Amino acid sequence: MIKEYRTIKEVVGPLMAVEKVSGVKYEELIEVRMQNGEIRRGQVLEVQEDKAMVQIFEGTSGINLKNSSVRFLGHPLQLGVSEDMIGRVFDGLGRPKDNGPEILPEKYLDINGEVINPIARDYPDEFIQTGISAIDHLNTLVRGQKLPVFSGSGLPHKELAAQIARQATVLDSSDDFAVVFAAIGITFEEAEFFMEDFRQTGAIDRSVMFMNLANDPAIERIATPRMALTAAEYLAYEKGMHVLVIMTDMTNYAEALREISAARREVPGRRGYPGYLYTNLATLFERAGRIRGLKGSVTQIPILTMPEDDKTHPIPDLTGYITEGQIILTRELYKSGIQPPIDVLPSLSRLKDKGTGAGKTREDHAATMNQLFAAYAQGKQAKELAVVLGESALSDIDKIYAKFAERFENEYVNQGFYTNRTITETLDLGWELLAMLPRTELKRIKDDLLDKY
Amino acid sequence: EYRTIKEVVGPLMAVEKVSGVKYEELIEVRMQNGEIRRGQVLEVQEDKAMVQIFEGTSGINLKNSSVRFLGHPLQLGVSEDMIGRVFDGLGRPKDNGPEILPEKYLDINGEVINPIARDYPDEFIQTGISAIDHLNTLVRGQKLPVFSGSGLPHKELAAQIARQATVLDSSDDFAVVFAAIGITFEEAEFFMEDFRQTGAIDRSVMFMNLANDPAIERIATPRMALTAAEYLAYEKGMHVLVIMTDMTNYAEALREISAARREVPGRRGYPGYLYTNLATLFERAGRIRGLKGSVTQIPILTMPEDDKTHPIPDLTGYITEGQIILTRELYKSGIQPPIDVLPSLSRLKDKGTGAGKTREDHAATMNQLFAAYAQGKQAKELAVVLGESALSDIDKIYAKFAERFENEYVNQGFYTNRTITETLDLGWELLAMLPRTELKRIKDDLLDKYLP
Amino acid sequence: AEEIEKTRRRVNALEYMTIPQLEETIYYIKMKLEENERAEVTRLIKVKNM
Amino acid sequence: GMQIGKIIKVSGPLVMAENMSEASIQDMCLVGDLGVIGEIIEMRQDVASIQVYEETSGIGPGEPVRSTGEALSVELGPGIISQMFDGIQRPLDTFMEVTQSNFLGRGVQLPALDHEKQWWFEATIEEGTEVSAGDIIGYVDETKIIQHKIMVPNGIKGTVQKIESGSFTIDDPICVIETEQGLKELTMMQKWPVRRGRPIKQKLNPDVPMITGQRVIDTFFPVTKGGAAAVPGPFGAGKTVVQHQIAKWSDVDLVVYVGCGERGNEMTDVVNEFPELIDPNTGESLMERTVLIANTSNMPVAAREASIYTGITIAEYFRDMGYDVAIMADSTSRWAEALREMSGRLEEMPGDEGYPAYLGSRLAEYYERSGRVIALGSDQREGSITAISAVSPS
Amino acid sequence: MQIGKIIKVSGPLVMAENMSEASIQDMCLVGDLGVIGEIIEMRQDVASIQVYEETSGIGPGEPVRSTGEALSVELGPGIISQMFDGIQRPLDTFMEVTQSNFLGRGVQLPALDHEKQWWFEATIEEGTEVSAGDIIGYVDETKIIQHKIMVPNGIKGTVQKIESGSFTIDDPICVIETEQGLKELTMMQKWPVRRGRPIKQKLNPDVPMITGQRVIDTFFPVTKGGAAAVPGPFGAGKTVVQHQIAKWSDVDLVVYVGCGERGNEMTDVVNEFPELIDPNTGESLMERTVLIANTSNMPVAAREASIYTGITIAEYFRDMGYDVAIMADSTSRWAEALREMSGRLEEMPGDEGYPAYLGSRLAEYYERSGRVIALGSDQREGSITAISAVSPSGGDISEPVTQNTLRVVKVFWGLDSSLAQKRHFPSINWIQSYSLYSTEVGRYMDQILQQDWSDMVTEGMRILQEEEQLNEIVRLVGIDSLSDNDRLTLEVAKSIREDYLQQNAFDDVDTFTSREKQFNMLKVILTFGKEARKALSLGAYFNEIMEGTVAVRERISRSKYIPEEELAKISSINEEIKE
Ligand SMILES: Nc1ncnc2c1ncn2[C@@H]1O[C@H](COP(=O)(O)OP(=O)(O)O)[C@@H](O)[C@H]1O
Ligand code: ALF
Ligand SMILES: [Mg+2]
C-alpha cells in the first residue's frame, strides 16, 4: 500500500525525524509532501524502534510540521537507465533539465551500484593516446584506469579535461569513447564553458550528463556522482561501450558529506571530515575497469581542487590511496604560462608498465621515460640552486642540466590545450631532450637502446 | 555468587545486583560451558559494577554466565624463595618450577616514602659502560632512566647493564628486578636467554608481560615488580636494581583503560593523572634512614617520533634524576652502545665520583672530555663549512679526538664490561692527543699525575 | 675578489632566504599543531557528552 | 556534627557520594573507610563529586565520607617554626616518630602543630583594652631566633576581660574578649585557608632594598623588601648554591622554603643541606627561623598544587607580626605541572601547551600577596614578604 | 530455538532483541535476505550485530538467526591456488552460482569444495597414540606443497581404523578411540579466525630470508618468522614490495591478503602467479599462494575478517612444518574499519579517532607469527613471516597506526616520497628505516660466504650516514669548499645509491639479486671507496681520479645486470679499480 505518515517529530537543518512508523528500510528513498504541495526527495539514514531519521536533499526550507507528510517509497534511490539517455542533460538528482521528452527507462538500477568480482575483472593494459606528451609518455593513461587530475582554485583544470576527451583514442582501432560528465557544486561559468567545448568537438551528443551547480542545495551532491557511475557501467558492460568518466568538482562532494556528517553529530576524523571518507570515495572510484567476456570498459578521470593547494589535505590524500596514480597541476607552472601546467615529478601512473613496450607504443618507451624523470629532477634541483647561489657557482655538468629542465618545460610539457601530438612524435621529442646530456650520464638506458636511438 | 550479567560491550561487562564491591577488585567469570575467566573492577556503582575480563568476552552468554567477587585487589605472594624464579605480569609462574609458599600477601600499590625519611644515595655503581660510569654516573638509590627509540638497541643495553651491574668492595651481591612491560615474545626470549646463559638469573627475579596480554595486565606489571623490590630491599636489607622496558607500553595501557572509562585525555591524548601515575612508580626507590637496603630504578622508554616534548619523556625528566639518551645517528654508524653524552645528564653524579668513591680524577676528566668533544665536533663541522684548510694544527687534533671518542670510548660493545680503572685511563689516552694547553679544566697537580 | 663574491652571495642567501624561510616555516608549524590539539580535545569533550 | 555521606559510585580517581547537603564546595573530605585525601569539586543536589588524590584501590560504594567542613587551611601558632610539613601541612617529623614507619600511610591523619606541648605565654596587654584584629596580646619565645607574637584573630571585636600569663598548650584559652556576639575565648592556635590571603590595612611600595650579601645582586640586579625575583635553574648552574647564600645572609626575619614538587633524591638534598646552614648572627641552625615545605613528586597532587599557597599563608601570618619574610619556591615549573594535571582530571578547556587557561591569574594570585604591607591593628606595623621563585623549563 | 527481531539499523550496525540464548562473537543471518553478521556487544536481550554485508533495504522487524559458532574457516584440501572474500567464500564459485559478475547479498557458500575427490595417502598406522597436531596422512594438493592432514585440536586418542583411498573432505578417513568415545576424523577442520592455532614452543627466528631486493637483503633484513612493516605515502612502492617479495621468497607458502585496496591489484596478482614458474621445481608461484581479497568498496566490517582469515590460513600451514609468508596490504584500511565502528558504538576515540585498543589488536595480530614448534610428536618446525604495509595520511608516520605498529614489529621499511618522485626504487629511506635483525643476520652472512659482511655492511651504512650529515650541512652552505677527501665520500654515496639501492622490478635482472651477486657489487663499491681513499692520500687532486675512472665507474653501474652465471664479471672490477 501507499506508506505515508503525518506524525513528524522534529526538523533540524537538513535532517528530519519521523515517529510512529513501521516497515521503514535503511537507505530508503522518501518524499515530503508539505502543507503547500511541494515535494522534496530524501533518503533514510537510521531506523530504530518506530522512528526514522532522514536527510532532505533539497533542504527543509519553510516546512510546517503539523501539516506535512512523509511518503516512504520502499526502495533505494534509483536511476531510470535507457539508451535514450545519450545526449541528455539531467540534474544532480536525475531529473532531465534540457526540456526534452521523458526517458522511457529500460531498467531501474540502484545508484549504489555493485562490486565487480576481482576474478571476473580484466586487467586494463590498453593504451590511450591522449595527445599530451606529459601523459602519453610520462604518466600513461589506459582504458579502464583510475587516473585523477589534481588541481587548485583558479588553475586551468577545466581546460585540461576538455583537451583529453577531445583527443582520446586507442591504437589500431576506431572505437569511440562514451564520455560521462557530472557537475558537483561548480559555478555556472565552468559548466557553460564545458558545454561549449563539447558542442565544438561534436561529441556532445555522445555524452550523458548530470548537473549540480553552486546555487543548488548541497545535500543532494552526495548522490550526484553515484548517478553517473550507475549510468556509466550501464552503458559499458551491458551495452558494450567504452565509457570515460570525468567529474568535477569532487572537492564540493566531500564538503557535502561533511555537512551531513556534522548534522548527524557523528564522530569526526581529520579536519572535521567523517572517518569513513576513504571508504565513501572508494564506492565511486572502484567502479572502473574491464570484465572478462564483456567488450565494455569504464575509465575514470576525476578532478578535484586541493583546498589550500595542500596535497596532505584529506581529500587529495585519500584519493591517491584509492586511484592508480594522479596528474598534478601546480600554480607555479601555470604561473609561467606552461600549457598544460602538469607537474610530472609528483605525478605517477601505476597501470602503464603493461600498457607500454613493443607492440603497444614503442619498444624503448620505458627506458626513455625512466631516463627523463631522473634528469628532470636533477635539472630542476640545479635551477633551484642557480637562482640562489648564482649561475656561475653551479657545476658545468649541472649547468648543462639546468638548460635540460628549461627546455623540458617550455617545449616538452608546454604544448597548448589544442595540440594532439602523436606518441611517435612524443617519444622522438624525448630523445632529443636526452641528446643534450653526454652518453655517459644516461645510465638507466641500456647500450642496446642507446645505440639504436 | 552472582549470575546477573546485564551489559557486555567488547571485553568490558557490567554486573548488577552487587554490594560491597571495591575498585580494582578481582572478579571471576563462570561461563555457561564451565570456563573460568578473571577480571578486575574498572568502575563500581551502587547497583552495578563494570569489569574488564583478561581473557576477553569471546563466546560468553550473559544469561547463563556467573561472576564471583573475590573482595581483594591484585596482591603479590611475596617470599624470599622468589630469587631465580620468573613470573608473568600477574605474578603467575612462567618457568614451571616449584611452587612458592607466600610469606606475605601485599597489594601491588605500595606506600609513599616520607621525604624526610629518605636517605642520600652515596655509593657508586659500576655499570661497566664508559659512557655511563664516567660521564653520567649512576648512584645506589637513584632514578636514572634510559631514553631510547623504536629501533634503537635498548634491549641489548638492558641485558648488559643488569649483567654488568656491581658495587665496589661491598661484599654483598646486587639484586636485580627486571620487568618486561608489553614487549614481544622475541625480545622477552632475548632477555630470558641472556639472564640464564650468564648466571645472572641466580641474582634476579623476572616479571614478564607480553604485548598480546591484556592492557590491565600491563598496568599491574610495574606494580608487581616494585612491590617485590620494595620487599627485597626494605624488608630484607638487600640492594635492589629495578629495570623496566618498555615503559611506553605501560602508558598506552593506561589509555585503553582511560578510554574504557570515557575519560577525556590531557596533553597529546594521554590521561590527565599520568604525572601522579608515573611518579607513584618512580619514587618507590632510594635508601631509607635506619635501613641498610636500597632500591635503584632504571626505567627504559622509547620516545614516540623521537620527541622529547612528548608527555612520556617530558614527565619522566621531571621525576627522575637525569636521563640516558640514545640517538639513531650513533647507532647507524656502528657505535655500541649508541649513548649520546651531550643531551644526557646525571643529577647525582657529583657524590658518586671522587676520592674513595672511584678516583680523584673522575670529576676533572669528566668535565675535560665533555668540553673536548663539543669543541671537536664543531671543528669537524668547520672542516665541512670552511674546509680542512681553515682548521689549524690544534683543530686537526680536536677533530681527531671526537672521531676517536665516538669509535673507541663510547663504542665499546654490548658485551664489554670496563672497570672504572680501565675507563678513566682510556679517557686520558684520548686526552693525551691534545696538548696540555688544551686541557684547561684539569689542574696541573693531577694533570702531571696521570697524563702519559 | 671572485672568492669574496662567492662567499658574499653565500652569506647573503642564508640571511635573506634560507634562515627566513625556516623562521617563517617554524611559525606555521607550531601554529598548526597547537590549534589542532586545541580543536582535537574540543570534540573529545563533545563526544564525552554522548 | 558533620553530616556523613555515603559513596554511591567510584570511578578512577573520582568518587561520588550522596547525603552531602551539609558540606560546602571545595572542602576537604576523608573518603571511604580508609579516609583518603579528597576534595569536593562539584555538587548537584545532595550528591557531591570528590576528586580523590590518593590511590582509589580498595574503596567502593557504601563506605562513608567525612567532610572536614572547611577548605584547605593551615594551623597557625606556636610549634610551626622549625618543623617540616608537606603541601597540605602534614608534619613529617611527627609522621616519622608516631607511626613508627617510614611511609605516609593512606588515611593516616595527624594534627599539624603540637597540641600537647607547653608554651610560656608572656601577656603583654592588660584587661580592659579595646582590641581588634591584629593587636598583639603577648609573645612566646617559640624558638631561639624568633619571638612568636600572638595576635588577635580576625573577626573578633571587643574588650579584653581577663588575661593572665603562664604556660598553656595551643588548645588552651589564654584570653577572653567581650565581643558584640557575646563573650569569646582566644587560643594560641588559629586556622586560615591557604586559598585566600590574610587581610591588610594598606599595601605599600617595596622600596626598601634588600642586602643579600652577593655583590652581583645588591649592585646591579637588586630585589627590594617585598619584591619578586624569578630564577631559571639549569643543571650545574649552582642553583642550590645561590639559594643557600640568600636564605642565610639576607636581612629577613623568617625563611619559608617551599618544595612544590621535586625528585626524591633531589629533595633529600634539601632536607639534609638546609638544616646544615648556620645563621650568621647567633651561630645556631637556620631551621630556627625557617618553616620548610617538603613535597616529592609522588605526593598527592593537592600537595603539589597548594604547595606555594601553603607557605605564602604562613608567610602572611608571620608578616602580620611585623616581620620581614622571604619565601622560596623551587621549582615553580613543577607547581604548574600540578595545575596542568588538575585541568586534565577536571576535564577543563586547555590553555597554552596543556597548562590551564587560568595559569596567568593563578600566578597573579600568588605574587600579589607578597609585598611590603601594613598589617591590621592599632600598631600599624610594616611586614614584608619577598618571593624568590625558581623556574625549570622543559 | 530463538528468532531475533531487529530494533535498529545504523549503517553496518544492526541491533536486535530476543537474543538471550546467543553469545558474543556468534555469526548471524540478518534480515529477510539473510546477510552475514556477527555479535560484537550484548546489552540485556538486545545484541549489537556487526554486519559484514550491505544493509540497504533492511529495517526493524525482520528475523535474525544465530549459528552457535564463531567466524571460522575450512582448513583442508582445496584451499591452495584459490581466492576467497573476507569470510573465505570462494569468489570463483560465487560467480558460477549467482551467474553474475557482481557481488550479491544473502548467500552463503562453503569455502572448500566438499564434492571434490582427493587421493589421501595414509602415513600413520592403526594402534598409535595420537594427539593434536599428529600427521595421519597427506594429500598432494599441488606439486611442491605436500598438504599433510593432521589431527585437529581437542582430539586425543588411539587410531583404530585408517587406510588410503579416494575420499572427499567430508568422508571419514580414520576412527580414533578417545575417552569420550569413537570419533571419526575428516580431512577438513574448522578453526576460529580470532583464536590463534596453538603450538608447543615459540622459537627465535635467526634464519634470514632471501627476498631478492638489494636494500632489503643487505641493510634491513627480515628473518623467517620476523615482522616487517612498510609505511609510506601513495605511489611510494608499498604494493610493489609485496608482489616482488611473494614472487621471489624461498618460503613454502605465501598468503597474500588484500585489505581495503583496489580490485585491479588482485587481478594481475592472480594472473601473474601461475606464470612465475620456479625453474628448480617446474611448478609456479600460484601453487603455493593463498589469496584473500576484500576490496575498498566492499563492506567495511569485512576488512577485520580478511586480516584474521589470512593469519589463520598461515597457521594451518605452519603447523605442518612449512615456512609461510603472510602479506597484509594494507593494514591501514583495517584500522579505518575499527574507528568507523567505534564511532557508531559511541566509544571513546584516541588520536585521530582511532579506538584505544588499536595497539592491543595490532599486538594480538603480529604475535601469532614467528618461529614456532608445532604441536605433535615429531616436533616439526614452522614459521610465519609477517610483511605489512601501512598507509598513513600524507606520509605522516606519527599516526597511531604506524606508531603502535613499530612497537611490536622488528623491521621497518619506511618508504619516502621524495625518492619515489625522483624515480628511485625501491624508495626505502636508508637513514629512516631500520632492522632489529641486522645484527644477527650479519653474523650468519659472515659465516655462509666466509667474509666480514657485518662490518662491510656497517661501512656502507656509515657512508650513507656520513652523506646525510654532509648533505644537511652542505645543502645551505654549498659544496664549493668541500675538502677533496669529503668529496670522495659524496661520490661513494652516489654510487651506493644509484647502483645498489636503485633497482627496478620490471626489468627481469634487477628483480632478483642472489647472495653471491649482492656481495660482488658491494665488494666493488666498497673496495673502490677504500682503495681510492689511498689514491687521494697519494697527493692526488679530486678532479683527476674520477676522470680517469669513468670506464670502471660504468661497469659498476651495470653490475646489477650481470647474469648469475657471469658473476666473474662483477668480481673482476676489483683489480681494475686498483690499477
Ligand atoms: N621497486 C620498484 N621498481 C620500479 N618501480 C617501482 C618500484 N616500486 C614502486 N614503483 C613505481 O611506483 C608505482 C606505484 O607503486 P605501488 O607499490 O603500487 O605504490 P603504493 O605505495 O601505493 O603501493 C608503480 O606503478 C611503479 O611504477
Ligand atoms: F596507492 Al597505495 F598504498 F596502493 F597509496
Ligand atoms: Mg599499493
Side-chain angles (χ1 to χ4, degrees), chain A residues 26 121 317 321 323 444 447, chain E residues 57 262 264 392-393 502 558:
Chain A
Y26 178 80
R121 260 186 200 264
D317 181 75
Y321 283 104
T323 66
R444 299 170 101 169
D447 292 357
Chain E
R262 53 168 70 81
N264 286 332
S393 202
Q502 276 196 94
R558 271 70 124 81

Side-chain angles (χ1 to χ4, degrees), chain E residues 450-458 460-462 464-469 471-481 483-495 497-498 500-509 511-514 516:
Chain E
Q450 199 48 257
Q451 299 267 31
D452 252 59
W453 177 263
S454 59
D455 297 18
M456 72 202 327
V457 165
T458 310
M461 193 50 154
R462 177 203 217 87
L464 300 180
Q465 178 66 30
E466 182 177 358
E467 185 199 20
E468 183 77 5
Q469 296 171 343
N471 241 113
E472 214 55 86
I473 311 234
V474 101
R475 187 274 94 91
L476 32 145
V477 159
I479 74 280
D480 201 51
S481 53
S483 36
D484 286 308
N485 169 282
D486 271 354
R487 226 305 183 79
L488 160 60
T489 331
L490 175 138
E491 287 296 330
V492 173
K494 175 172 182 174
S495 59
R497 288 182 292 103
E498 192 269 328
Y500 195 77
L501 273 65
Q502 276 196 94
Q503 103 186 38
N504 176 4
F506 300 115
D507 155 273
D508 177 272
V509 140
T511 255
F512 203 112
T513 289
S514 58
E516 301 185 10

Side-chain angles (χ1 to χ4, degrees), chain B residues 26 49 57 83 85 127 224 244 272 283 293 330 339 349 384:
Chain B
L26 293 180
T57 62
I83 303 295
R85 329 286 335 289
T127 67
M224 289 275 174
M244 287 160 295
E283 294 291 344
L330 293 175
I339 296 172
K349 60 188 175 181
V384 179

Side-chain angles (χ1 to χ4, degrees), chain B residues 398-399 401-414:
Chain B
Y398 274 104
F401 166 82
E403 193 170 0
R404 283 190 55 184
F405 185 89
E406 305 225 308
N407 298 324
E408 304 178 10
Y409 188 95
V410 184
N411 181 22
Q412 58 182 96
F414 294 116

Side-chain angles (χ1 to χ4, degrees), chain E residues 20-23 25-31:
Chain E
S20 60
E21 282 290 332
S23 304
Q25 308 296 130
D26 291 357
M27 308 308 294
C28 297
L29 295 317
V30 186

